[PDB]
Amino acid sequence: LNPSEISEIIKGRIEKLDVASQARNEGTIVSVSDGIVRIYGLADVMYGEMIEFPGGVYGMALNLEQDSVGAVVLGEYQGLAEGMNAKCTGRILEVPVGPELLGRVVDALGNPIDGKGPIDAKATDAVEKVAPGVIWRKSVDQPVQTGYKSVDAMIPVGRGQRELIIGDRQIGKTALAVDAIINQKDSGIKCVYVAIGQKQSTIANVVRKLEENGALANTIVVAASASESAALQYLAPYSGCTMGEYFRDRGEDALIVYDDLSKQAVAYRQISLLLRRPPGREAYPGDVFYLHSRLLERASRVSEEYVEKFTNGAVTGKTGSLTALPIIETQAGDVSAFVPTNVISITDGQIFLESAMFNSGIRPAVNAGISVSRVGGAAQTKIIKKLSGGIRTALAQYRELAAFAQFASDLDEATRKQLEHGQRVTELMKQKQYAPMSIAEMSLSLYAAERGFLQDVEIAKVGSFEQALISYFQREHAALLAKINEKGDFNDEIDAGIKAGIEKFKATQ
Amino acid sequence: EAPSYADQAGGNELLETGIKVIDLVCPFAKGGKVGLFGGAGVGKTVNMMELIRNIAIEHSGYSVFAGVGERTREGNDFYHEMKDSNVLDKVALVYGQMNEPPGNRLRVALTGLTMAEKFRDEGRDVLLFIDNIYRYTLAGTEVSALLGRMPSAVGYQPTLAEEMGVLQERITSTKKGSITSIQAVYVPADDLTDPSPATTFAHLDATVVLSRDIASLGIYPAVDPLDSTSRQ
Amino acid sequence: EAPSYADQAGGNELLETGIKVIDLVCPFAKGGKVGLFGGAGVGKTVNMMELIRNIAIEHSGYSVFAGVGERTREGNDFYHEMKDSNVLDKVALVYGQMNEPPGNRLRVALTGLTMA
Amino acid sequence: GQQLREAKAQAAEIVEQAKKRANQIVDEARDQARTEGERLKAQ
Amino acid sequence: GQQLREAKAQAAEIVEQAKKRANQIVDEARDQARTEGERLKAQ
Ligand SMILES: Nc1ncnc2c1ncn2[C@@H]1O[C@H](COP(=O)(O)OP(=O)(O)OP(=O)(O)O)[C@@H](O)[C@H]1O
Ligand SMILES: Nc1ncnc2c1ncn2[C@@H]1O[C@H](COP(=O)(O)OP(=O)(O)O)[C@@H](O)[C@H]1O
Ligand SMILES: Nc1ncnc2c1ncn2[C@@H]1O[C@H](COP(=O)(O)OP(=O)(O)O)[C@@H](O)[C@H]1O
Ligand SMILES: [Mg+2]
Secondary structure, eight states: OOOSGGGGHHHHHHTTOOOSOOOOOEEEEEEEETTEEEEEEOTTOOTTEEEEOGGGOEEEEEEEOSSOEEEEESSOOTTOOTTOEEEEEEEESEEEESGGGTTOEEOTTSOBOSSSOOOOOSEEEESOOOOOOSTTBOOOOSEEOOSOHHHHHHSOEETTOBOEEEEOTTSSHHHHHHHHHHTTTTTSOEEEEEEESOOHHHHHHHHHHHHHTTOSTTEEEEEEOTTSOHHHHHHHHHHHHHHHHHHHTTTOEEEEEESOSHHHHHHHHHHHHHTTOOOOGGGOOTTHHHHHHHHHTTSOEEOHHHHHHHTTTSSOSOOEEEEEEEEEEOSTTOOSSHHHHHHHTTSSEEEEEOHHHHHTTOTTOBOTTTOEESSGGGTSOHHHHHHTTTHHHHHHHHHHHTTOTTSGGGSOHHHHHHHHHHHHHHHHTOOOTTOOOOHHHHHHHHHHHHTTOSTTSOSTTHHHHHHHHHHHHHHSOHHHHHHHTTTOOOOHHHHHHHHHHHHHHHHHO | OOOOSTTBOOOOOEEOOSOHHHHHHSOEETTOEEEEEEOTTSSHHHHHHHHHHHHTSSOOSOEEEEEESOOHHHHHHHHHHHHHTTOGGGEEEEEEOTTSOHHHHHHHHHHHHHHHHHHHHTTOEEEEEEEETHHHHHHHHHTTTTTTOOOOGGGOOTTHHHHHHHHHTTSSOBSSOEEEEEEEEEOGGGOTTSHHHHHHGGGOSEEEEBOHHHHHTTOSSOBOTTTOEEOO | OOOOSTTOOOSOOEEOOSOHHHHHTSOEETTOOOOOOOOSSSSHHHHHHHHHHHHHHTTOOOEEEEEEEEOHHHHHHHHHHHHHTTOGGGEEEEEEETTSOHHHHHHHHHHHHHHO | OHHHHHHHHHHHHHHHHHHHHHHHHHHHHHHHHHHHHHHHHHO | OHHHHHHHHHHHHHHHHHHHHHHHHHHHHHHHHHHHHHHHHHO
């Protein structure tokens, strides 16, 4: 297992060492307080430049005054002391980018924390950027499938869309975003998951659930846990966004989750209040809308001319995109609070998760009254857009009539049948964790709801009915499901084959 | 500077919008000023796009559209919509969106207003559309403590009403020509007594207030009829 | 520092307490955190001594108490109640009392966590 | 009597479709068991 | 009517019995692959 000659690497490192003197621009630490260091000197430092301290500690220059430089420490500050040396690096704040980060867990500066060796990235890129302009965009029409029936039927997400996931604590926000990540393992869309302010055992459970479902090799994980510095918690979404923008700028497609943007705003509030900046609503800084809007604008779809301009002619005739799913935690259903209303004013729709529907066992818990997608059916495939026109109206007729089931035997026929269809569509949209459905299976369930094949089936046997129907179409009509799973086409042949299979299921099974 | 008191033009000629609540309870005038107040995701942009589409029917002059601190995707959609339907050659577009540093967002509405002032001083009747005028004001928040100023109430700049007045008093019709203006106005955390909309209210002829409760009932265009007034 | 990402144990292994309502209705995780609610006089201290006795005798572990803002009367009472229930030698006691300046009351949980 | 023998034949056909569904889910579980054992080996 | 209700109630039993065979096959394959994994890592 371990021969002795393979440890001769040290000799080769000695043969690639430059021992010539190089000129540096240097300074001295004057004061250290709460992650903020004042430095004398450093007369050639740039705004946003990494500053090297002893022990491998870096900082970023924020306040270039005439006689001092204020820097924010990008790590633990507690080993820094007055009198220690500071050096310019020549580098505005960078992260490594590339396909070599796929499968790896890193921190906010790209250093690996999973114990699987060094990352051999061939390129770095800047953390702070301005998003590309008005003329370089293209309108969103390709689908991103989350694998959930309620999300892919009602609130569809496209390539380049920003779609917020918002709701109270412990009602499934990480679950919806992680299952949207796991459904990209055979679709060509690469994935970035940024955890901000979470517990480390939660992050390790998330990466173990990514490896157990076969999607870790498609996903970069960037982690800044709850006992890190607030600088790394503030800077980790932009670092993961640069990691997704590598695949955006070369005509490929990526998808990023920010699993709490609400904890990033708390960390930026901490940094701004320690700099004695004057606050506004809820003690947040005045530029807090700008904190989210500089990030989420970077998620976009860019045209073929932008991709041809970026790669200098290497990639021709391809668009690239980056889809974002930010996540916001609310307090007791208050969606009119300052940070939630700032992020709604930025995204292209949102998915509201309701605590009462979660506590009644309606487990994907999507409030269909107020969830919306601004792109809509321009992103959707044809069979899914055709069969989901009657879902939202069946859930709408159920909203008020769901409290009438205790006296519904003394009601008229249209109100009774609308309430029966509402209970059937509500029982159809329940779905377990870690069970994705394809285009053909959600089309089978949506056709079973929409065309009236749920009418003689009771409520407690709806979803078991759905599972049996899926199994029957997997063993009798597998070429039909492979026809639907190509690009989601719909015509009269597919219509007739689905309705003949459902009638043979309802007659013989 | 603003045009003088002797150069002001009066007029109350009605502008029909085709929308029932707007024509009923807060009617518009040609050469007048319109605010569309509302919180996050209640409709402001959808209403402005409908007001652009229906005010374009009986208007034959030019238009200036200024995007101040809003979505870059909305700018690309509106440009490709006007280019596809061949009305792009009447409209001048200025954009300083949410992705920009705050000097660009602080000064882009002055550029769009300068182009509308040149069209007004050639003796024409022009339309001026500004999506979020609140985003000029918030850019003046972001640089205010860096300019050495002590904060006013709820962290705003102390020069709030003067920056609003120096911008809003150039938008008017004069005796040379007329400007009809539609401006979307953001309300922070759905609070109408926040100082930025509360200073914005007296600069306008017609005020359309949108409501999250009326839109949560399913009613669009979501106008509160007891909170929307106009002098017409 | 906190333990690192590679030092996490993994899984969702339960800690058996031996109490039936706790192990049925609201089960505890190893490495987990338990909020405890309620007023006074409903049996909080007796539940704490029973958890100390059960983790010492049946699982061969120890306990550390850290009293953040400890009232002096109740700390003397809790010390004599743990002498009379034979569970004093199973737990290390750290008090940061109420009449102390607030850095003592800030760092007393870090002291008890270091012994744990 | 004639509708009783038709009821007995429909009972036997319902039983045979249950055994066909049973053989299907046992076969899919064998395929799932094979690919999950290969994933734990590779890990 | 008794015979048709008895046939549907037996069909649900056949589907649930094969589901328990499905869960046993997949969980024993996961456990056997894990034990051979700890054997190779200790070796
Ligand atoms: N579709 C589902 N069916 C059943 N249980 C589910 C489903 N989705 C989520 N859950 C359960 O709901 C619980 C809460 O989910 P989750 O941890 O994703 O919530 P969250 O809102 O992201 O919470 P956190 O505050 O930790 O970020 C979990 O224990 C999870 O197993
Ligand atoms: N007239 C309308 N009809 C239907 N839906 C509407 C209407 N106006 C607004 N909405 C819904 O509200 C969303 C937000 O509208 P938008 O104009 O973007 O809001 P705002 O400008 O206030 O942020 C729309 O994308 C749509 O889902
Ligand atoms: N397990 C128990 N069995 C019987 N009585 C109990 C039990 N736990 C508590 N009690 C009763 O409740 C009272 C309050 O208990 P205690 O733990 O001392 O509360 P506190 O510490 O808040 O004063 C005790 O005096 C005792 O009589
Ligand atoms: Mg808008």
